[PDB]
């Protein structure tokens, strides 16, 4: 019965530790259900099952601020941070109690009485945001964030006869039909077409291009309502735009009277060094999208902050754009807690020193294995290593998973991996990571070399065997023996 | 500073009671901020400020399961239930601890490791849902619910060459651009047009119409992908469709190979008498949208449950439709708690007896004041009273607000008011409500009559004064004195 | 005529369709491209700014002047304009569309923009 299934899951919430067969039990239901009620695919493409072991790595509870412990007790260092969620770490004590307090009083609002925390957050965000960004709208996610932004721009610009929206190729903005009209990857968009009419993509980091789009549209009577872009393409592979770009986009917008929308969903809340990435070039957008880390990894939340000139649209009919759960008290709680922590222990500043020590650490590794890595890149605690193959990439992401270091990448989309550990990552865990990636890079180089030695056609078995022998006895020579085998295979060529 | 504003709001979370000037202080910031950072409009159109009093009615904390207490200590009976959110009441002790437990372990997931509660919920929902509905997708709201539904239908039906979507006039489904393409009110849609191409509306409760839409589209090569409707139009004014309709829609769909999407966002989780409204006619949709009350008024959540045949689309590329926060552990917690409570204290069954005692109670009041009410209507604990004017309606919703009974309606959209108290409303509070609405209906009838006596043109001041005199001395004669004044005004006519 | 035109036209141009005007000309062209390319999953059409191709709703979707188009919008979905004589631009349009899953059905242009003011494109264009 559903009554049955509810209770069994209800008692498991209460349980805090597990007998080894209580574990086995669990992991087998959880795989069983994932296959029959969730998606069977996540069992196919995820690194938690491929490299799971005998059992998958089913989540259990948070370890420290930076660690995660599965149902077997294995503790993982999070260098994923839920793709930019866990900026203040897992269960940050300051956020968890702000939530638990608010939970004692009133978790959600009535929707009729002026709820106080939504004012306080709207206020704080006004304070925290650059230039004339004043009004906040509150939703539940990063996609609802962008949607409302699109709606604001729309309601603003359509009376002025402007309907077209420029977005950028490689841009991600959300999976809901409205945001998916601005999101750019082929794969994500094609099945659900036709999407919103009038969304046109230009290359990212290309101001010369965006002028031509804004101008062509002008000429043909399809004038641009708004331009929407991320400060850094996060999912897009940690693409950094050319210095001056965001500033130059900002003028270009101002020149053509087009609203500028900044999707700071993955670069907001101090990840890139500054509280908002658009502060590195000190650029003020007309609209700013926030989410993910705004909810301190405790709560889900999305905020849309805009200038007064733009948010005015909603003033005369405030019900034009509502949401049911948006701005609920205990989500509010969470953010104010997160906003407080970020300014107190001043973690944007931490983001920049840990963010360069790490990244440098990776582009060093990247010089030492140019045969497995094209490049590493990032800005503050948002960074990514680009491998040569998805084969290799998924092999890196997977290898370290076993070294109990949790990074990105799935079975297929894995050519470039992303490193996004909490901003609260210690200097001790910082090395432990670059160390783990060095071991990982060694072992892969071993395997890569290993095959290389085998299809050497001119090389005979007698010689090949000598190399394979010294390879296993000395994996350090994986590069030397290789060169010696290739040099030998060419000798008999 | 933002650091400053964060802390002040942070300490207020900690505070549990307020000195009367600590109150005054609060309510004035909260109004001040709402005007300068949230919306000034909500101060114009909401009943919390118009009828606020000297101060507005700023929320503070939950009272009992059915009561809410503002910053002045005034306790309100919730006959709104957050528009169908608070189905198991405010802070239902069983939900709050399931949440607080899960909060001690891990609030959000890593997105790499198989999270156990999302299996358990996916499982339970499979159990709880009629027919072949098997797979659940998890999002954050009611709008994200429908969006994914639209996306499932799309990804299913577009390979089969079907792109058009029929929705119904009066339908509400969400404010995000995708759902807003199916949502039907003019007001909500117009500013943001052009929306998704290929959405066509037909009248609700009209099977004769929907045949013609499905057939016309067939003829013209624009074959219907899916039909989407609510079992009852909730926001649409508690519109009940003709018996047999939902069943007859279900065949019509099956006949034209069109997917049937049921928006049980506001009629789900036991409000109408059954766990899902589509069980009264025992109809199984291809897709089912859930939200609101699924989160036990503690958490925000949305679920999209579908048949295997349909959810298969996502199997081969499970990342086609993801969301960042969807299915997070502590939202999961909340639902399983809510699902458990609803089956335990068997509250759908409570919904039907309280839902008829109330509603009958209103259509009685409705016979006694036919000059202020056209009709009352509902199905289980979803019900609404329809007045004659928005003037009158906002006057009812507002009047009772002061009688500390919290109902729907805003300053303008208020012709029909909705009654949606928690399913945990006691029989004692049940009368207290019908009583409060009787007082309210009296006082309005007084005022209505009062003006009626004044523009009686043939009536002189001397006579008019006698009526006004007895009116104030005996408001019960408001009907009698009126008839006597009108009869007198006609005597001098 | 179908024969003669086959003779008169360069390369593998073989079949002629006959209509009544210059606008009906382009419309059918758009229709041919469409019926050809939509089974192959290609729906977008690149045209050029300054281009004139016709005043009927289909051709007017490819015609480019603001004045001529605005009152009758919304026109055919999926028509995007690039500057004329700019091969560097048209690559980016064809490529951006590729990336976003909106692959280009056909590109339509005049050899010289006539009404467009006798615009001559760069040699090689």
Swiss-Prot record, chain C:
Single GO MF annotation: putrescine--2-oxoglutarate transaminase activity
Residues bound to pyridoxal 5'-phosphate: 22-23
Keyword tags: Aminotransferase, Pyridoxal phosphate, Transferase
Technological use: Can be used in the industrial production of the value-added compound 5-aminovalerate.
Induction record: Up-regulated under nitrogen starvation conditions. Expression is sigma-54-dependent. Up-regulated by putrescine; this gene expression regulation is controlled by at least two sigma factors: rpoS under excess nitrogen conditions and rpoN under nitrogen-starvation conditions.
Observed effect of gene inactivation: Cells lacking this gene show a high decrease in putrescine aminotransferase activity, but are still able to grow with putrescine as the sole nitrogen source. However, a mutant lacking both patA and either puuA, puuB or puuC cannot grow with putrescine as the sole nitrogen source.
Origin: domain of life: Bacteria
Gene Ontology CC terms: cytosol
Assembly with partners or alone: Homodimer.
Purpose: Catalyzes the aminotransferase reaction from putrescine to 2-oxoglutarate, leading to glutamate and 4-aminobutanal, which spontaneously cyclizes to form 1-pyrroline. This is the first step in one of two pathways for putrescine degradation, where putrescine is converted into 4-aminobutanoate (gamma-aminobutyrate or GABA) via 4-aminobutanal, which allows E.coli to grow on putrescine as the sole nitrogen source. Also functions as a cadaverine transaminase in a a L-lysine degradation pathway to succinate that proceeds via cadaverine, glutarate and L-2-hydroxyglutarate.
Protein name: Putrescine aminotransferase
Source species: Escherichia coli (strain K12)
Complete-protein stretch covered: 129 to 253 of 459
């Amino acid at each position: 019965s559903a009554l049955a299934c509810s209770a069994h899951a209800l008692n498991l919430i209460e349980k805090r530790t597990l007998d080894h067969e209580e574990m086995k039990a669990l992991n087998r239901e959880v795989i069983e259900y994932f296959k029959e009620h969730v998606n069977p695919g996540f069992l196919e493409y995820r690194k938690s099952v491929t490299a799971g072991g005998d059992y998958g790595a089913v989540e259990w509870q948070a370890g420290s601020l930076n660690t995660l412990v599965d149902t077997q007790g294995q503790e993982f260092i999070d260098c994923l941070g839920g793709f930019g969620i866990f900026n203040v770490g897992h269960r940050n004590p300051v956020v968890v109690s702000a939530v638990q307090n608010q939970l004692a009083k009133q978790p959600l609002h009535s929707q009729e009485l002026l709820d106080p925390l939504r004012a306080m957050l709207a206020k704080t965000l006004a304070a925290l945001t650059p230039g004339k960004l004043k009004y906040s709208f509150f939703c539940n996610s990063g996609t609802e964030s962008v949607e409302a932004a699109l709606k604001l721009a729309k309601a603003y610009q359509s009376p002025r006869g402007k309907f077209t929206f420029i977005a950028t190729s490689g841009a991600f903005h959300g999976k809901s039909l409205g945001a998916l009209s601005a999101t750019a990857k082929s794969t994500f968009r094609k099945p659900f077409m036709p999407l919103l009419p009038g969304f046109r993509h230009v290359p990212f980091g290309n101001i010369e291009a965006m002028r031509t789009a804004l101008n062509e549209c002008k000429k043909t009577g399809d004038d641009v309502a708004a331009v929407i872009l991320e400060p850094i393409q996060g999912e897009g592979g940690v693409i950094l735009p050319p210095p001056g770009y965001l500033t130059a986009v900002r003028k270009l917008c101002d020149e053509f009277g087009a609203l500028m929308i900044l999707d700071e969903v993955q670069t907001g809340m101090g990840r890139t060094g500054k509280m908002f990435a658009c502060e590195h070039e000190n650029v003020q957008p007309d609209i700013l999208c926030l989410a993910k880390a705004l909810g301190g990894g405790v709560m889900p939340i999305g905020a849309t902050i805009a200038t007064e000139e733009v948010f005015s649209v909603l003033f005369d009919n405030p019900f034009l754009h509502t949401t049911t759960f948006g701005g609920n008290p205990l989500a509010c709680a969470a953010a104010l807690a997160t906003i407080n922590v970020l300014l107190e222990q001043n973690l944007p500043a931490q983001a920049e020193q840990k963010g360069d020590m790490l990244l440098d650490g990776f582009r060093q590794l990247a010089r030492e294995y140019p045969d497995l890595v094209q490049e590493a890149r990032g800005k503050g605690m948002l960074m990514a290593i680009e491998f040569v193959d998805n084969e290799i990439g998924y092999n890196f992401a997977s290898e370290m998973f076993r070294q109990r270091v949790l990074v990105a990448g799935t079975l297929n989309n894995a050519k470039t991996i992303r490193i996004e550990p909490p901003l609260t990552l210690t200097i001790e865990q910082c090395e432990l990571v670059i160390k783990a990636a060095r071991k990982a890079l060694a072992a892969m180089r071993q395997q890569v070399a290993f095959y290389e030695i085998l299809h050497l056609p001119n090389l005979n078995e007698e010689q090949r065997n000598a190399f394979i022998q010294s390879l296993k006895d000395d994996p350090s020579q994986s590069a030397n023996l290789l060169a010696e085998a290739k040099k030998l295979n060419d000798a008999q060529a």
